[PDB]
Every structure is written in C-alpha cells, then in structure tokens.
RNA sequence: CAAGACGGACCAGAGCGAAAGCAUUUGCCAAGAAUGUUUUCAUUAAUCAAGAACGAAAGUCGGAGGUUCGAAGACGAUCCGUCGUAGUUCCGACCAUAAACGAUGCCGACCGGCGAUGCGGCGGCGUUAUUCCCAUGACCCGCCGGGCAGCUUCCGGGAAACCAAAGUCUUUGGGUUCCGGGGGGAGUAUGGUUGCAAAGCUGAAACUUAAAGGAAUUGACGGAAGGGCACCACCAGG
C-alpha cells in the first residue's frame, strides 16, 4: 500500500467542503484510488487499492489535491490529471526584491492589477494559472510557459508598469 | 574500473527494546581490508526514523534520531540521539490569529545525558469567543514560559533515559503543560518539539543491553 | 432629537456619565465600614484605598490595594456608609 | 566629461587618475568645443577636440609603479593617505612586494614586524599623512614614490 | 441561538478583512486611483470525511 | 548481490532530490545517509546548458537512478526534497517533481515524502541588491 | 568544530517612543503614557527669536572584527555574470542631511451617527481551569476615560480631488511660533560662519520673460484585443 498525506490550511477547509464532489469523483472513477479526509489530523489521505493501474496517477492525484490546497481552481487540477507535463512553481514576492510595508502591498496590486485583469491577461498570454497568496505566487503550467509567466511577474514587481509588461508579454507570446 | 558495491556488504540496523517495531532496516558497509575496520565506519551513524514506523498505532509527525554505535555480527545496536517534529506539522501548527510561546531548558538527567528541550505552545480561542484573535499578554506569556521550564526541570531531571523516552513516545510532558497552563491562558497544541543531545557520558555496553534486552 | 432639558437630566444618564462631565461633578467612591471576621470592631475604609489597611487591634489585613476598588479579605463584612 | 577630466588641474572636482597620469606622461591641450549637429546620429553629450603629444624623452618614472601607487591612493579620493594605506588589501600587496624585496636582498624580517606601522611612520615622515588624494599634484606623488622606493616599498 | 453566535463570529471575521482593505485604500491619496474607482462605481452523506471512500472497500 | 531480504519485505533507501535553479541531483543513499548508491545530475544526461534544469533531463536521470537501484535490489525509497534554501528561494522547482514522478513511473516504492530544505531563522544579506530582481 | 551576521513564520486593523526608530530567552537598572483617586501644592501655565539634547542611510578620524552582501576595480559576455577593494558589524569622536510625509505647527473650546480594536477602571447573569471545594486567570454582556484606525452624513467648507477638519470665514478677531508674495537668473556670485574633509547654515543683484501652475468632465480617432459565421475562407482530399 502507498500512502500520501496532503495538509490542509485552516482557510482551505470551507472550499474543500464546497468542492469535495469534484475532488473525489475524478479520483474514485477513472484513477482507481481510495481517498479520505482525516478530520482529526486534517489531511487528505490517498492510498492505493486492488483496482489501480498506471501507478504514476497516484503521484498526479497527490499533485491534484495539492493544487487545490495551494488555491488553484478545480478544473485546472483536472487538466493536471489529464495532461502529462504540468508543473507548479512557487516563490514569495520578497524572494526577488526586499520590499517592506506599503511597497509590498503595491507590488501585490501590480501583480493582480485592477479588477484582477492584469493577472488574467497574463494567464491568457501564457496558458497558465497564477494564484496569489498573501506574499507567495504559484504558477501552474508547462516549463516554458512557467518561465514566461515568471518573467512577466518579476518584471511587474520590479517597477515596470502593467501596460508595458502587458504589451511586451502579448508580443513575445508569438514564438 | 571495478564496482565497489560487490565489495560492500549489508548489515541489519535495529531499534532499542522501548520500541515495538525493532527491525528498522539495513545498512551498507565495506568489509575490512586491514586499513580501516567496518566498526569504525559503523560506530557513529545517525538514522532519522519516523515514529509511525516504530509503533503501529502511534502518530506520524514525530521523528526520532537514533545513533548506532556498536556492531554484533550483522546486527547494529542503536540508542536515543534526538527528537523532532516533521516540518509539515510545524508549518501547519503556526496559525495566524494567536500567540506562540517557546521554551527551552538545558536539563541533566539522572545518568549524565545532558539534554536540551524545546517546546512550543499556542493560545486557544474559546468555544464562546467572538473576538477574532486570542493574543496573550506579555506577563501571561512569561508565566506560561516559566511553568514550561519548571515542568520540564521537574519531569526530566528525576528520571533516566528509558522513562524519558517512554514519556516522549506519546508526549505526556506536553499534555502535562497544556493541563497546567489552563489557569494562565488556555493553550492549544503543546508539544516538546525538539530534543537535542549536547553531552553523552562515557561509553558503556551494559546499559545498551537493557536498552536492547 | 434637538429637544431635551439639559437642566434636569435623569438619574440613569447622570450616573452613566464621567464623574467630571456631569451637570455638577461628584465622586464615584464611598466610605464603607468593615467588621473583621476575627473581631467585632468597626473600621472605616475608603473604597478606592491605596494603602493596605490593618486592624487597629487584630492587625489582620482588611483590604489589599488594586488598580481601582480595594479588594477586601474574604470573611470580612462591609456596609455602605452614609 | 572625458575631455575636461583629461585636462584637470589639481583642486578641480573632475581630477582623476587619468588627469594626473596624462599630465605626467604627456602634454595635453583642449582645443575647440564641437557641436554634435556635425555628427549622425548626434551623440548623447557634447563633443570636444583634444591635442596630445607624449614627452620625449619621458620623465624617469616607472609607469607601472606610478599607476599602482595612484591606484592605491584613488580607491577613495577624498580619504586621507593614512586611511588609504590602512586598507587590508593594500597591506597584502605591500607585504608581497616587501617579501620579494627581502628575498632578493637577503634582509632578515623581524617577527614583531608590522608593515602598516612602517607605512604609517614613513607617511608621517613624508608629511602626506593628513593630505588627501584629491588635492595632490604630480610633484607630491613623485616625492611620495621616491620616499616609498627609498624605504624598499614597491607597488609594481 | 448558537447559529446566530456563529453568524456573529463570521461577521467579526468579515469586518476584519473589510476594515483592513479600507485602511489600505484610505492610505492611497493618488488622484488617478480615486478617479478610476469613481469611474468603476459609476459604471456599476458525503464519502470522504468519515472513512476510506473507495471502490474496493468503504 | 543485494540484501538478503525475503520477497514480502522491502528494503529502504532515502533519495535526496536537490532541485537547484540550474540542474537537479538524484542522490540515493541508505537510511543513515553516510554511504551512497546512485546520484546523477543533469550534467551527465544532457549535453546542453539549455536543458540542464529541464524536467526531461531530471526525468531521464531518475530513470537511470531507478534502474541502478533495481540492479542493486533497492526496492523502495524515502524522498527528501530540497531547494536551494538559505537566502534564496525555498520551494523545490519543477525538476524535483519531474524526478519524483519519473521514479514513481519506474515501479519503485515511494516511502515518506518530506520537504527538507535549508530554511533559516534569519540570515545574511541576499545575493541581489536593493534593486535587482530575477529579470 | 569555529567565526561573524541576523532574529523569519507567530507579526496585525496591533503596540511603544519627542522624533529618528523599536521583534530570541533571562536577569538587573533607570525612566514612561493611560487609568484609579473625597491625596498634596495652589496659577506654579501656552508658544517660540537666542543658546543647547537627539537625529535613518551614506560620509570622515582612531582602534577591533571581517560570514554574507558590495560602491570602485580586474576580467567574460553584450540592462548581466565571476572575483572582490572602501564599506556593511562593534567601540570612541565628528558630519546634522532625506519623499526626515498626513507633501497638512503647537495649545484650547464647540459641532452627527455606527460598531470594531489596544490599555486601565466599573457593574453583571452564565461557560470553562477533566462539573474546579471561595477567589483568581480565559471567554460573554454593557458603561466610562485617554488612544490607533475605519464606514457613513444636504453640519458646514473647498477651484475640485475631497475634509468631522482642510468646519465654526466678507455674518471676516481664542493664544502664539515659523514662513510665501508671477516664471527664471539661482541656492548662483559675494561676504560671514560651522566642519579634518565631503559638505552644512545664511544668501543677492544686474538682467530676462507673459506666463508659470492646480483640479476635473469629455466627443471622434488609423487602430488593438476577445468571439461568431462562410468550401464565393481554411485542414485532408476529388
């Protein structure tokens, strides 16, 4: 038997309650794995059974629920199950420049943009999914798309305006 | 130009008698070629073994460091070296709207093993509480820390290694602290999060024998 | 709204206000008389007393000073005075 | 910028290593201020013309030695030569060169020797201890190099 | 009773997030930000939890 | 050759998957961690500095390490993930995930997953300046 | 094993400080606001020219230490990379400047609502300290005081953004300090003065110009992006 434990934070319990159906139904139907949610230790527990094939699905299944722990939407992690080369890379905003106080919140606002649209635009440029924590940034996609999204984000918080990075990333996506 | 792994051999590393699952695995040593012996390369090796592989029903977030220091013909003999919590559990325990209290004592046990104890505790929101945060004041924090230090001083210094380890297996000391600090500020997750081994006494073989059987 | 007699406030409002901000200021403290459990003597103690008060004959601590009102020893009896 | 740093007199804010070195090895004249409409594309800063000719024969100064000493003194130009020579890298290079000199001439180094103390007392013996590098002319550097070379301290 | 108690606790948490955002926005004195936000305002039984829920065993 | 272990019972090693921001190291060792069995980088696997940190190179490295461990008869692995740590970024990159799913694809038993990366209490000044980001 | 550095997560809608600033435990030392008060003194106060204390970072003069980072510099590419000097760390002297910000003197009065938060105090059922054997801590309800910060508002005000002060202002007077007088010349010349130095404080005129500047609402606009349809468009074909 193979054991995977995925931790859940305190703020992720309610979206896990509201999205549990679309979490166990993809696993229990076509991945052939047993899943439960240990409330006593607060862990999503995944183990194999007698009806599992292609054991790497287990690994992807863990990454599946890991994405929903990190804040990603459900169907993106469904695409993580369906596709074969999808990865997530995370870094804090202060991991590339020392920002304090109101500067850090301004960096958060520059990543998100007004209405979220700037972040949304970068997604539609790079075919990736970007989730902002309080200070951490998580990018889900393939390797080169992760690199383009990470370069766009690192330019956005360097001080470059969202319009300039917007135009540059919308032009450089034709390669 | 020639593989050293054929030249290697396998030894069996085993837990003390305080633990239910005793066979903790295998180790790969080279045979003695007359220059260096296998024992000298084997008498100092540290193993990071989780508690859930030592007891069938115990927790998984607790890890024990076991130092092997003897060989008995393909049977490594180990002893307590340290304790720690898994970093996933430590990251999960530090929630936001509360107070973190840490205490550490340098305590000498009954037979000379100088231990260092680190414990952590968190204030608990009451069942009827409407305030979002539960922040302990500074003097309350100092009182909780003082009681932590005195409880470990009165709890470890009077016992030997077998009793200390048998108390650390279910963390009875943390439960004692959580029960005792209830009249200062209610605490939430009290664990002895880290045990070090600063000073070991002179090497004895018999005490290892009652630690093993 | 905009229509009330400031000259005649009710007891609940004038009680509720700060002791300086009433119509005419008045203290919130009082003098109270205390019987020691081990004796019969009367001691007149300020409610907000800052000194520890000993019995003149028994030398038993009647009250301990706190930030506001004094903390009587358990066993002591007290009555509001005047 | 380069043309005015090239012809800089001591006391000017544009005095640099280029100024003192080019005033040592050669004679320079700033000739005529050139507008940039004469170029295509017109450059960033204005343009200028410099007439230069080397002194033939050159003054009998080792240019590697001169440039090394000036490189030490212009690490911080507004800082005094005493504090310029308190630097540990300066002590390292002068230790290397003084060890070379003692190896060549068979001079026995005492155990309690301090190279920095030696440099400090020679610099006070010269009178450049309280002077700063931004206000020194060619002749002061010539005297300093003469004293340091007479004391067996070389920069190479 | 207890449901209103949980509602009040949720209300305290939501007011905390709202007042944090309010102070953060009130620090911002740039006229472009205020103009853009003015334009924007004028424009407008479960398997799992209990035990091992799987095909092989329940 | 290999441990004298019955078929039902498995033998355990621990695999450090060090996902540096330029390549990935696959270092299999015993439970003690002192002596080694297999470790191949992106360096021996791809002859291009472009793909030194690619998921493909770490994948092929993990397949080579897995077949080496099977030839040694190591039937299981504990995983100790690691990023650069210290002053730098604290999260393992895509290379570590690629190596992990690759050695899961090879039928190797996976034991305890654990993130063991050098988190400081606090440390010295970072490599970048007051100004310099990644790009 | 050692050396120097730094105290993350907890860490905020927090708190403290005159400001600059302040986050490991423990002990010692001397301060401090608010609260409480039927204590004492009895006008002892407010505001600043002169003169003095403190003042981030960088900088200068002596030492100590030099882990990381790193002006300069040497190299390799063509805003980057490798190495790394002065420095960054500590002690003792200087320098006294910042977007040192609320781009917003200080003291005093009056003038809407709300429910949150930090400290102190007061009143009150209840739940907890494995029903705690009385108090005490933690929660809960309400009130009072000094705070930090919000939302709301035909109080009024403003050129407007907006302000519970930027209000109580042509219906123009509570007290007092510093300071501006169209744009440049120009923080320049000159003199004085402080500083080891870098520089700091004070600071013009001749002349020249018709502007300089603040706030907000806006049609069209080659285009640009998201979609949809079509074998008079495409893929595979005949």
Swiss-Prot record, chain B:
Glycyl lysine isopeptide (Lys-Gly) (interchain with G-Cter in SUMO2) cross-link: located at 14
Q: Write out the GO cellular component annotations.
A: cytoplasm; cytosol; cytosolic ribosome; cytosolic small ribosomal subunit; endoplasmic reticulum; extracellular exosome; focal adhesion; nucleolus
Q: Where in the cell is it found?
A: Cytoplasm; Nucleus; Nucleus, Nucleolus
Which keywords, in A-to-Z order, does the entry hold? Acetylation, ADP-ribosylation, Cytoplasm, Differentiation, Isopeptide bond, Nucleus, Phosphoprotein, Ribonucleoprotein, Ribosomal protein, Ubl conjugation
Q: Which residues carry this modification: ADP-ribosyltyrosine?
A: 135
Primary site of residence: cytoplasm
The Gene Ontology biological process terms listed for this entry are: cell differentiation; cytoplasmic translation; negative regulation of apoptotic process; ribosomal small subunit biogenesis; translation; translational initiation
Residues the record lists as N6-acetyllysine modifications = 14, 36
Question: What does the entry report about post-translational modification of this chain?
Answer: ADP-ribosylated at Tyr-135 by PARP1 in presence of HPF1.
List GO molecular-function terms, semicolon-separated. mRNA 5'-UTR binding; RNA binding; structural constituent of ribosome
Q: rRNA-binding as a keyword?
A: no
Assembly state and interactors? Component of the small ribosomal subunit. Mature ribosomes consist of a small (40S) and a large (60S) subunit. The 40S subunit contains about 33 different proteins and 1 molecule of RNA (18S). The 60S subunit contains about 49 different proteins and 3 molecules of RNA (28S, 5.8S and 5S). Identified in a IGF2BP1-dependent mRNP granule complex containing untranslated mRNAs. Binds with high affinity to IPO4. Interacts with DDIT3. Part of the small subunit (SSU) processome, composed of more than 70 proteins and the RNA chaperone small nucleolar RNA (snoRNA) U3.
For this entry, the protein name equals Small ribosomal subunit protein eS1
From Swiss-Prot, chain D:
Highest taxon above the source species = Eukaryota
Localization, per the record, is:
Nucleus, Nucleoplasm; Nucleus, Nucleolus
Instruction: Name the family the entry cites.
Output: Belongs to the class I-like SAM-binding methyltransferase superfamily. rRNA adenine N(6)-methyltransferase family.
What the protein does comes down to: Specifically dimethylates two adjacent adenosines in the loop of a conserved hairpin near the 3'-end of 18S rRNA in the 40S particle. Involved in the pre-rRNA processing steps leading to small-subunit rRNA production independently of its RNA-modifying catalytic activity. Part of the small subunit (SSU) processome, first precursor of the small eukaryotic ribosomal subunit.
Q: State how it assembles.
A: Part of the small subunit (SSU) processome, composed of more than 70 proteins and the RNA chaperone small nucleolar RNA (snoRNA) U3.
Q: What is this protein called?
A: Dimethyladenosine transferase
Native source species: Homo sapiens (Human)
Q: Which residues of the full protein are shown?
A: 158 to 313 of 313
UniProtKB/Swiss-Prot annotation, chain E:
Location(s) in or outside the cell:
Nucleus, Nucleolus
What does the UniProt PTM comment say about this protein? Citrullinated by PADI4.
Q: What is the tissue specificity?
A: Ubiquitously expressed.
Q: What's in the misc comment field?
A: The human genome also contains the UTP14C gene, an autosomal retrotransposed copy of this X-linked gene. Evolution of autosomal retrogenes from X-linked progenitors compensates for X-chromosome silencing during male meiosis.
* Known role: May be required for ribosome biogenesis.
Q: Which family does it belong to?
A: Belongs to the UTP14 family.
What is annotated about its quaternary structure and interactions? Answer: Interacts with DHX37.
Q: What is this protein called?
A: U3 small nucleolar RNA-associated protein 14 homolog A
Source taxonomy lineage? Eukaryota, Metazoa, Chordata, Craniata, Vertebrata
- Give me the gene this protein comes from: UTP14A
List the range of the whole protein covered here: 220 to 640 of 771
Swiss-Prot record, chain F:
Query: What positions does the cross-link Glycyl lysine isopeptide (Lys-Gly) (interchain with G-Cter in SUMO2) connect?
Result: 45, 47, 90
Q: Which domain of life is it from?
A: Eukaryota
Protein's cellular compartments: Cytoplasm; Nucleus, Nucleolus
Q: Which residues carry this modification: Phosphoserine?
A: 123
One GO cellular component assignment for this chain's record is: extracellular exosome
An example Pfam family from this entry, by short name, is Ribosomal_S11
Tell me which UniProt keywords the record has, alphabetically. Answer: Cytoplasm, Isopeptide bond, Nucleus, Phosphoprotein, Ribonucleoprotein, Ribosomal protein, Ubl conjugation
Question: In what ranges is there compositional bias, type Basic residues?
Answer: 126-135
InterPro entries named among the record's database cross-references: Ribosomal_uS11, Ribosomal_uS11_CS, Ribosomal_uS11_sf
Give the region (Disordered) as residue ranges: 115-135
Per the UniProt entry, what is one GO biological process?
cytoplasmic translation
> Predominant location of this chain?
cytoplasm
Phosphothreonine modification sites are 117
Gene Ontology MF term list: mRNA 5'-UTR binding; RNA binding; structural constituent of ribosome; translation regulator activity
Name the family. Answer: Belongs to the universal ribosomal protein uS11 family.
Tell me how this protein assembles: Component of the small ribosomal subunit. Part of the small subunit (SSU) processome, composed of more than 70 proteins and the RNA chaperone small nucleolar RNA (snoRNA) U3.
What this chain does, per the record?
Component of the small ribosomal subunit. The ribosome is a large ribonucleoprotein complex responsible for the synthesis of proteins in the cell. Part of the small subunit (SSU) processome, first precursor of the small eukaryotic ribosomal subunit. During the assembly of the SSU processome in the nucleolus, many ribosome biogenesis factors, an RNA chaperone and ribosomal proteins associate with the nascent pre-rRNA and work in concert to generate RNA folding, modifications, rearrangements and cleavage as well as targeted degradation of pre-ribosomal RNA by the RNA exosome.
Please report the name of this protein according to its UniProt entry. Answer: Small ribosomal subunit protein uS11
Gene designation per UniProt: RPS14
């Amino acid at each position: 038997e193979e054991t995977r434990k995925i931790p859940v934070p305190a703020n992720r319990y309610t979206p896990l309650k509201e999205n549990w159906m679309k979490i166990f139904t993809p696993i229990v139907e076509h991945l052939g794995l047993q899943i439960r949610f240990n409330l006593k230790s607060r862990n999503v527990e995944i183990r194999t059974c007698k009806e599992t094939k292609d054991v790497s699905a287990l690994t992807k299944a863990a990454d599946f629920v890991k994405a929903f722990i990190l804040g990603f939407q459900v169907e993106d992690a469904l695409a993580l199950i369906r596709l074969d080369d999808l990865f997530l890379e995370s870094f804090e905003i202060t991991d590339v420049k020392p920002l304090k106080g109101d500067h850090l919140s301004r960096a958060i606002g520059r990543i998100a943009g007004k209405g979220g649209k700037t972040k949304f635009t970068i997604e539609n440029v790079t075919r990736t999914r970007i989730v902002l924590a309080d200070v951490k940034v998580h990018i889900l996609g393939s390797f080169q798309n992760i690199k383009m999204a990470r370069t766009a984000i690192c330019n956005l918080i360097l001080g470059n305006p969202p319009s300039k990075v917007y135009g540059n990333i919308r032009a450089v996506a034709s390669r | 130009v020639v593989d050293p792994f054929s030249k290697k051999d396998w030894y069996d590393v085993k837990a003390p008698a305080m633990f239910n699952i005793r066979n903790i695995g295998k180790t790969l040593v080279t045979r003695t070629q007359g220059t260096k012996i296998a024992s000298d390369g084997l008498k100092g090796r540290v193993f990071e073994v989780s508690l859930a592989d030592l007891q069938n029903d115990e927790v998984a977030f607790r890890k024990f460091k076991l130092i092997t220091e003897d060989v008995q013909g393909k049977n490594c003999l180990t002893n307590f070296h340290g304790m720690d919590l898994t970093r996933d559990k430590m990251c999960s325990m530090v929630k936001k709207w509360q107070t973190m209290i840490e205490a550490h004592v340098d305590v000498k046990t009954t037979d000379g093993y100088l231990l260092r104890l680190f414990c952590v505790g968190f204030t608990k929101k009451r069942n009827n509480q409407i305030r979002k945060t539960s922040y302990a004041q500074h003097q309350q924090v100092r009182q909780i820390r003082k009681k932590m230090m005195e409880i470990m001083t009165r709890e470890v210094q009077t016992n030997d290694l077998k009793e200390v380890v048998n108390k650390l297996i279910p963390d009875s000391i943390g439960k004692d602290i959580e029960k005792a600090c209830q009249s200062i500020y209610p605490l939430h997750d009290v664990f002895v999060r880290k045990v070090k081994m600063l000073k070991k006494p002179k090497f004895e073989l018999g005490k290892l024998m009652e630690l093993h059987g | 709204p905009l229509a009330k007699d400031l000259l005649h406030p009710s007891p609940e409002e004038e009680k509720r206000k700060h002791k300086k901000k009433r119509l005419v200021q008045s203290p919130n403290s009082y003098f109270m008389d205390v019987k020691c459990p081990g004796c019969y003597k009367i001691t007149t103690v300020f409610s907000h007393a800052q000194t520890v008060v000993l019995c003149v004959g028994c030398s038993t601590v009647l009250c301990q000073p706190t930030g506001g009102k004094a903390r009587l020893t358990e066993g002591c009896s007290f009555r509001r005075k005047q | 910028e380069f043309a005015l740093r090239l012809v800089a007199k001591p006391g000017d804010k544009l005095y640099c290593r280029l100024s003192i070195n080019t005033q040592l090895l050669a004679r320079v004249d700033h000739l005529m201020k050139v507008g940039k409409n004469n170029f295509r594309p017109p450059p960033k800063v204005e343009s200028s013309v410099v007439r230069i000719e080397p002194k033939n024969p050159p003054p009998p100064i080792n240019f590697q030695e001169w440039d090394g000493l000036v490189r030490i003194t212009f690490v911080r130009k507004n800082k005094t030569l005493s504090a310029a020579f308190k630097s540990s890298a300066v002590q390292q290079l002068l230790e290397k060169n003084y060890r070379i000199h003692c190896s060549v001439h068979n001079i026995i180094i005492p155990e309690d020797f301090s190279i920095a103390d030696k440099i400090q007392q020679i610099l006070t013996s010269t009178g450049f201890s309280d002077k700063r590098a931004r206000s020194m002319d060619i002749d002061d550097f010539i005297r300093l190099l003469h004293g340091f070379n007479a004391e067996g301290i070389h920069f190479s | 009773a207890k449901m209103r108690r949980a509602e009040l606790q949720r209300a305290r948490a939501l007011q905390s997030y709202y007042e944090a955002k309010a102070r953060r926005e009130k620090k911002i004195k740039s006229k472009k930000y205020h103009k853009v936000v003015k334009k924007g305002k004028a424009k407008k039984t479960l398997p799992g939890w209990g035990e091992w829920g799987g095909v092989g065993l329940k | 050759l290999g441990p004298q272990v019955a078929e039902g019972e498995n033998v355990f090693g621990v695999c450090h998957i060090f996902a540096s921001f330029n390549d990935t190291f696959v270092h299999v060792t015993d439970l003690s961690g002192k002596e080694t069995i297999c470790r191949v980088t992106g360096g021996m696997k791809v002859k291009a500095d472009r793909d030194e940190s690619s998921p493909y190179a770490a994948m092929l490295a993990a397949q080579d390490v897995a077949q080496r461990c099977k030839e040694l008869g190591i039937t299981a692995l504990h995983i100790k993930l690691r990023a650069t740590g210290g002053n730098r970024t604290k999260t393992p990159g895509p290379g570590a995930q690629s190596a992990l799913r690759a050695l899961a694809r090879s039928g190797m038993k996976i034991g305890r997953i654990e993130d063991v990366t050098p988190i400081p209490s606090d440390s010295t000044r970072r490599k970048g300046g007051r100004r310099g980001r990644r790009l």
